[PDB]
Amino acid sequence: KVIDIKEIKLSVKIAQNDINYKVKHALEFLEQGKHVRFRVFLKGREMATPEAGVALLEKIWTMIENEANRDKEPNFEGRYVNMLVTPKKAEGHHHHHH
Numbered sequence: 452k453v454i455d456i457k458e459i460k461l462s463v464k465i466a467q468n469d470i471n472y473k474v475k476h477a478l479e480f481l482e483q484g485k486h487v488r489f490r491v492f493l494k495g496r497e498m499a500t501p502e503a504g505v506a507l508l509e510k511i512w513t514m515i516e517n518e519a520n521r522d523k524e525p526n527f528e529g530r531y532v533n534m535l536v537t538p539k540k541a542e543g544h545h546h547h548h549h
Contacts, residue, residue, distance in 0.1 A: 458488040463497045463507060474514045481519055481538035484547075489525075490533045504532025512536070 457480050459473050477487045489508050497503040508525035511534070518539050525534035540546070 454486065456486040456488055458490055461489060461491045461507060461511070462494060463491065463503045464494055465507070470511065470514070474511060477511075477515055477536070478518050481515075481536065482540065484538050484540050484543075486522070486535060486537060487519075488533060488535050490531050492531050493527075498530070501527030501532060508532060508534040 457477075459477055461470065461473065477489075480487055489511055491504045491507055493501075493504055504527055505525045512519070512521060512525075515536065519536040520539050520541070522535035522537045525532055
């Protein structure tokens with residue numbers, strides 16, 4: 452595959468500073484025309500509530516929605532809640548290789 456995708460991980464019990472830092476890189480990779488897969492693993496106690504991961508991911512989406520497109524919704528599947536964002540620089544079609 453020519454499409455390289457970065458899978459950035461987060462946690463329910465995560466610092467906001469860490470989230471902020473991660474969305475920065477997420478945006479930069481999007482600017483490269485790549486995809487970032489946000490995956491969150493429920494630590495243990497919060498594993499009883501999948502919505503915790505969903506809410507975390509939604510916050511991320513809120514932060515980067517300015518330069519990111521939403522590929523799908525965050526959902527709990529395989530003990531990981533994942534959401535994917537497509538770069539807004541997509542559909543260039545001719546915008547590659549100088």
